[PDB]
Amino acid sequence: MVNIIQKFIPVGANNRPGYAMKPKYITVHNTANTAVGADAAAHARYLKNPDTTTSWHFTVDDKEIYQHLPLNENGWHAGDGNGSGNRASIGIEICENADGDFAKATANAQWLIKTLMAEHNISLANVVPHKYWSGKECPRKLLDKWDSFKAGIG
Ligand SMILES: [Zn+2]
Incomplete structure:
Protein backbone atom coordinates (compact mmCIF):
# COMPACT_ATOMS: atom_id res chain seq x y z
CA MET A 1 0.00 0.00 0.00
CA VAL A 2 1.38 3.34 -1.21
CA ASN A 3 0.16 6.70 0.08
CA ILE A 4 -2.02 8.49 -2.47
CA ILE A 5 -2.25 12.26 -2.13
CA GLN A 6 -5.16 13.91 -3.89
CA LYS A 7 -4.58 17.30 -5.51
CA PHE A 8 -7.25 17.70 -8.17
CA ILE A 9 -6.70 20.24 -10.94
CA PRO A 10 -9.34 22.87 -10.27
CA VAL A 11 -12.59 22.63 -12.23
CA GLY A 12 -12.42 25.23 -14.96
CA ALA A 13 -8.73 24.91 -15.73
CA ASN A 14 -8.01 24.43 -19.45
CA ASN A 15 -6.44 21.02 -18.90
CA ARG A 16 -9.47 19.71 -17.01
CA PRO A 17 -12.11 19.01 -19.68
CA GLY A 18 -14.51 17.51 -17.16
CA TYR A 19 -15.93 15.10 -19.75
CA ALA A 20 -17.60 12.09 -18.09
CA MET A 21 -15.55 8.89 -18.32
CA LYS A 22 -16.07 5.17 -17.62
CA PRO A 23 -12.49 3.82 -17.79
CA LYS A 24 -11.97 0.59 -19.68
CA TYR A 25 -8.21 0.93 -20.20
CA ILE A 26 -5.17 2.08 -18.25
CA THR A 27 -2.39 3.99 -20.01
CA VAL A 28 1.17 3.87 -18.68
CA HIS A 29 3.53 6.84 -19.25
CA ASN A 30 7.07 8.00 -18.39
CA THR A 31 7.51 11.70 -17.64
CA ALA A 32 10.85 11.57 -19.50
CA ASN A 33 11.90 14.36 -17.10
CA THR A 34 15.18 13.56 -15.36
CA ALA A 35 15.55 16.88 -13.54
CA VAL A 36 16.09 16.92 -9.79
CA GLY A 37 12.88 17.35 -7.83
CA ALA A 38 10.65 16.41 -10.80
CA ASP A 39 8.61 14.08 -8.60
CA ALA A 40 4.91 13.36 -8.07
CA ALA A 41 4.24 16.45 -5.97
CA ALA A 42 6.15 18.47 -8.59
CA HIS A 43 3.87 17.22 -11.35
CA ALA A 44 0.80 17.95 -9.23
CA ARG A 45 1.85 21.59 -8.96
CA TYR A 46 2.83 21.69 -12.62
CA LEU A 47 -0.64 20.47 -13.62
CA LYS A 48 -2.36 23.16 -11.58
CA ASN A 49 -0.42 25.81 -13.55
CA PRO A 50 -3.00 27.98 -15.36
CA ASP A 51 -1.13 27.61 -18.65
CA THR A 52 -0.71 23.81 -18.67
CA THR A 53 -2.36 21.91 -21.48
CA THR A 54 -1.97 18.19 -20.75
CA SER A 55 -3.34 16.23 -17.82
CA TRP A 56 -3.56 12.69 -16.36
CA HIS A 57 -4.96 10.93 -13.29
CA PHE A 58 -1.93 9.62 -11.41
CA THR A 59 1.77 10.40 -11.05
CA VAL A 60 4.07 7.92 -9.31
CA ASP A 61 7.57 8.29 -7.89
CA ASP A 62 9.62 6.13 -5.54
CA LYS A 63 8.04 7.73 -2.48
CA GLU A 64 4.32 8.24 -3.12
CA ILE A 65 1.41 8.85 -5.49
CA TYR A 66 -0.54 11.93 -6.56
CA GLN A 67 -4.03 12.04 -8.06
CA HIS A 68 -4.76 15.05 -10.30
CA LEU A 69 -8.14 14.00 -11.69
CA PRO A 70 -11.23 12.13 -10.47
CA LEU A 71 -11.62 8.66 -12.05
CA ASN A 72 -14.96 9.65 -13.66
CA GLU A 73 -13.36 12.33 -15.88
CA ASN A 74 -10.84 12.21 -18.73
CA GLY A 75 -7.50 13.87 -19.26
CA TRP A 76 -5.27 14.69 -22.21
CA HIS A 77 -2.28 12.37 -22.40
CA ARG A 140 10.52 4.82 -22.86
CA LYS A 141 12.27 2.99 -20.01
CA LEU A 142 9.52 0.39 -19.89
CA LEU A 143 8.82 -0.43 -23.54
CA ASP A 144 11.90 -2.60 -24.08
CA LYS A 145 10.76 -4.98 -21.35
CA TRP A 146 7.06 -4.14 -21.50
CA ASP A 147 5.88 -7.76 -21.17
CA SER A 148 7.97 -8.18 -18.03
CA PHE A 149 6.46 -4.96 -16.61
CA LYS A 150 2.91 -6.23 -16.99
CA ALA A 151 3.92 -9.69 -15.71
CA GLY A 152 4.87 -8.00 -12.47
CA ILE A 153 1.57 -6.18 -11.90
CA GLY A 154 -0.26 -9.20 -10.49
ZN1 LIG B 1 3.18 9.35 -22.60
Missing part, protein backbone atom coordinates in the same frame (compact mmCIF):
# COMPACT_ATOMS: atom_id res chain seq x y z
CA ALA A 78 -2.70 9.58 -24.99
CA GLY A 79 -2.39 12.10 -27.80
CA ASP A 80 -5.21 10.42 -29.72
CA GLY A 81 -7.92 13.09 -29.68
CA ASN A 82 -11.29 11.61 -28.85
CA GLY A 83 -9.93 8.07 -29.08
CA SER A 84 -10.25 5.59 -26.21
CA GLY A 85 -6.78 6.59 -25.03
CA ASN A 86 -7.89 10.02 -23.79
CA ARG A 87 -11.62 9.30 -23.53
CA ALA A 88 -11.76 5.88 -21.85
CA SER A 89 -8.56 5.24 -19.89
CA ILE A 90 -6.80 6.04 -16.63
CA GLY A 91 -3.53 7.86 -17.23
CA ILE A 92 -0.55 7.09 -15.00
CA GLU A 93 2.83 8.81 -15.13
CA ILE A 94 6.04 7.36 -13.66
CA CYS A 95 8.67 9.92 -12.63
CA GLU A 96 12.28 9.80 -13.77
CA ASN A 97 13.83 12.43 -11.47
CA ALA A 98 17.54 11.62 -11.21
CA ASP A 99 17.30 12.03 -7.44
CA GLY A 100 14.83 9.17 -7.17
CA ASP A 101 14.74 5.43 -7.84
CA PHE A 102 12.90 4.40 -11.02
CA ALA A 103 12.78 0.75 -9.98
CA LYS A 104 11.00 1.75 -6.77
CA ALA A 105 8.69 4.12 -8.64
CA THR A 106 7.82 1.24 -10.97
CA ALA A 107 7.09 -1.10 -8.07
CA ASN A 108 4.77 1.59 -6.63
CA ALA A 109 3.12 2.01 -10.05
CA GLN A 110 2.57 -1.73 -10.41
CA TRP A 111 0.79 -1.68 -7.06
CA LEU A 112 -1.49 1.17 -8.19
CA ILE A 113 -2.38 -0.52 -11.47
CA LYS A 114 -3.20 -3.77 -9.67
CA THR A 115 -5.54 -1.96 -7.28
CA LEU A 116 -7.03 0.06 -10.12
CA MET A 117 -7.78 -3.12 -12.07
CA ALA A 118 -9.71 -4.57 -9.14
CA GLU A 119 -11.75 -1.42 -8.54
CA HIS A 120 -12.83 -0.81 -12.14
CA ASN A 121 -12.80 -4.36 -13.50
CA ILE A 122 -10.09 -3.71 -16.06
CA SER A 123 -8.31 -6.77 -17.51
CA LEU A 124 -4.53 -6.98 -17.68
CA ALA A 125 -4.89 -6.90 -21.48
CA ASN A 126 -6.38 -3.38 -21.24
CA VAL A 127 -3.22 -2.15 -19.48
CA VAL A 128 -1.46 -0.59 -22.43
CA PRO A 129 1.40 1.85 -22.99
CA HIS A 130 0.98 5.31 -24.43
CA LYS A 131 2.56 3.99 -27.67
CA TYR A 132 -0.56 1.88 -28.15
CA TRP A 133 -2.67 4.97 -28.98
CA SER A 134 -0.35 7.50 -30.64
CA GLY A 135 2.65 5.36 -31.54
CA LYS A 136 5.00 7.57 -29.52
CA GLU A 137 7.99 6.01 -27.68
CA CYS A 138 6.34 6.03 -24.23
CA PRO A 139 6.95 4.65 -21.55
Whole structure:
Protein backbone atom coordinates (compact mmCIF):
# COMPACT_ATOMS: atom_id res chain seq x y z
CA MET A 1 0.00 0.00 0.00
CA VAL A 2 1.38 3.34 -1.21
CA ASN A 3 0.16 6.70 0.08
CA ILE A 4 -2.02 8.49 -2.47
CA ILE A 5 -2.25 12.26 -2.13
CA GLN A 6 -5.16 13.91 -3.89
CA LYS A 7 -4.58 17.30 -5.51
CA PHE A 8 -7.25 17.70 -8.17
CA ILE A 9 -6.70 20.24 -10.94
CA PRO A 10 -9.34 22.87 -10.27
CA VAL A 11 -12.59 22.63 -12.23
CA GLY A 12 -12.42 25.23 -14.96
CA ALA A 13 -8.73 24.91 -15.73
CA ASN A 14 -8.01 24.43 -19.45
CA ASN A 15 -6.44 21.02 -18.90
CA ARG A 16 -9.47 19.71 -17.01
CA PRO A 17 -12.11 19.01 -19.68
CA GLY A 18 -14.51 17.51 -17.16
CA TYR A 19 -15.93 15.10 -19.75
CA ALA A 20 -17.60 12.09 -18.09
CA MET A 21 -15.55 8.89 -18.32
CA LYS A 22 -16.07 5.17 -17.62
CA PRO A 23 -12.49 3.82 -17.79
CA LYS A 24 -11.97 0.59 -19.68
CA TYR A 25 -8.21 0.93 -20.20
CA ILE A 26 -5.17 2.08 -18.25
CA THR A 27 -2.39 3.99 -20.01
CA VAL A 28 1.17 3.87 -18.68
CA HIS A 29 3.53 6.84 -19.25
CA ASN A 30 7.07 8.00 -18.39
CA THR A 31 7.51 11.70 -17.64
CA ALA A 32 10.85 11.57 -19.50
CA ASN A 33 11.90 14.36 -17.10
CA THR A 34 15.18 13.56 -15.36
CA ALA A 35 15.55 16.88 -13.54
CA VAL A 36 16.09 16.92 -9.79
CA GLY A 37 12.88 17.35 -7.83
CA ALA A 38 10.65 16.41 -10.80
CA ASP A 39 8.61 14.08 -8.60
CA ALA A 40 4.91 13.36 -8.07
CA ALA A 41 4.24 16.45 -5.97
CA ALA A 42 6.15 18.47 -8.59
CA HIS A 43 3.87 17.22 -11.35
CA ALA A 44 0.80 17.95 -9.23
CA ARG A 45 1.85 21.59 -8.96
CA TYR A 46 2.83 21.69 -12.62
CA LEU A 47 -0.64 20.47 -13.62
CA LYS A 48 -2.36 23.16 -11.58
CA ASN A 49 -0.42 25.81 -13.55
CA PRO A 50 -3.00 27.98 -15.36
CA ASP A 51 -1.13 27.61 -18.65
CA THR A 52 -0.71 23.81 -18.67
CA THR A 53 -2.36 21.91 -21.48
CA THR A 54 -1.97 18.19 -20.75
CA SER A 55 -3.34 16.23 -17.82
CA TRP A 56 -3.56 12.69 -16.36
CA HIS A 57 -4.96 10.93 -13.29
CA PHE A 58 -1.93 9.62 -11.41
CA THR A 59 1.77 10.40 -11.05
CA VAL A 60 4.07 7.92 -9.31
CA ASP A 61 7.57 8.29 -7.89
CA ASP A 62 9.62 6.13 -5.54
CA LYS A 63 8.04 7.73 -2.48
CA GLU A 64 4.32 8.24 -3.12
CA ILE A 65 1.41 8.85 -5.49
CA TYR A 66 -0.54 11.93 -6.56
CA GLN A 67 -4.03 12.04 -8.06
CA HIS A 68 -4.76 15.05 -10.30
CA LEU A 69 -8.14 14.00 -11.69
CA PRO A 70 -11.23 12.13 -10.47
CA LEU A 71 -11.62 8.66 -12.05
CA ASN A 72 -14.96 9.65 -13.66
CA GLU A 73 -13.36 12.33 -15.88
CA ASN A 74 -10.84 12.21 -18.73
CA GLY A 75 -7.50 13.87 -19.26
CA TRP A 76 -5.27 14.69 -22.21
CA HIS A 77 -2.28 12.37 -22.40
CA ALA A 78 -2.70 9.58 -24.99
CA GLY A 79 -2.39 12.10 -27.80
CA ASP A 80 -5.21 10.42 -29.72
CA GLY A 81 -7.92 13.09 -29.68
CA ASN A 82 -11.29 11.61 -28.85
CA GLY A 83 -9.93 8.07 -29.08
CA SER A 84 -10.25 5.59 -26.21
CA GLY A 85 -6.78 6.59 -25.03
CA ASN A 86 -7.89 10.02 -23.79
CA ARG A 87 -11.62 9.30 -23.53
CA ALA A 88 -11.76 5.88 -21.85
CA SER A 89 -8.56 5.24 -19.89
CA ILE A 90 -6.80 6.04 -16.63
CA GLY A 91 -3.53 7.86 -17.23
CA ILE A 92 -0.55 7.09 -15.00
CA GLU A 93 2.83 8.81 -15.13
CA ILE A 94 6.04 7.36 -13.66
CA CYS A 95 8.67 9.92 -12.63
CA GLU A 96 12.28 9.80 -13.77
CA ASN A 97 13.83 12.43 -11.47
CA ALA A 98 17.54 11.62 -11.21
CA ASP A 99 17.30 12.03 -7.44
CA GLY A 100 14.83 9.17 -7.17
CA ASP A 101 14.74 5.43 -7.84
CA PHE A 102 12.90 4.40 -11.02
CA ALA A 103 12.78 0.75 -9.98
CA LYS A 104 11.00 1.75 -6.77
CA ALA A 105 8.69 4.12 -8.64
CA THR A 106 7.82 1.24 -10.97
CA ALA A 107 7.09 -1.10 -8.07
CA ASN A 108 4.77 1.59 -6.63
CA ALA A 109 3.12 2.01 -10.05
CA GLN A 110 2.57 -1.73 -10.41
CA TRP A 111 0.79 -1.68 -7.06
CA LEU A 112 -1.49 1.17 -8.19
CA ILE A 113 -2.38 -0.52 -11.47
CA LYS A 114 -3.20 -3.77 -9.67
CA THR A 115 -5.54 -1.96 -7.28
CA LEU A 116 -7.03 0.06 -10.12
CA MET A 117 -7.78 -3.12 -12.07
CA ALA A 118 -9.71 -4.57 -9.14
CA GLU A 119 -11.75 -1.42 -8.54
CA HIS A 120 -12.83 -0.81 -12.14
CA ASN A 121 -12.80 -4.36 -13.50
CA ILE A 122 -10.09 -3.71 -16.06
CA SER A 123 -8.31 -6.77 -17.51
CA LEU A 124 -4.53 -6.98 -17.68
CA ALA A 125 -4.89 -6.90 -21.48
CA ASN A 126 -6.38 -3.38 -21.24
CA VAL A 127 -3.22 -2.15 -19.48
CA VAL A 128 -1.46 -0.59 -22.43
CA PRO A 129 1.40 1.85 -22.99
CA HIS A 130 0.98 5.31 -24.43
CA LYS A 131 2.56 3.99 -27.67
CA TYR A 132 -0.56 1.88 -28.15
CA TRP A 133 -2.67 4.97 -28.98
CA SER A 134 -0.35 7.50 -30.64
CA GLY A 135 2.65 5.36 -31.54
CA LYS A 136 5.00 7.57 -29.52
CA GLU A 137 7.99 6.01 -27.68
CA CYS A 138 6.34 6.03 -24.23
CA PRO A 139 6.95 4.65 -21.55
CA ARG A 140 10.52 4.82 -22.86
CA LYS A 141 12.27 2.99 -20.01
CA LEU A 142 9.52 0.39 -19.89
CA LEU A 143 8.82 -0.43 -23.54
CA ASP A 144 11.90 -2.60 -24.08
CA LYS A 145 10.76 -4.98 -21.35
CA TRP A 146 7.06 -4.14 -21.50
CA ASP A 147 5.88 -7.76 -21.17
CA SER A 148 7.97 -8.18 -18.03
CA PHE A 149 6.46 -4.96 -16.61
CA LYS A 150 2.91 -6.23 -16.99
CA ALA A 151 3.92 -9.69 -15.71
CA GLY A 152 4.87 -8.00 -12.47
CA ILE A 153 1.57 -6.18 -11.90
CA GLY A 154 -0.26 -9.20 -10.49
ZN1 LIG B 1 3.18 9.35 -22.60
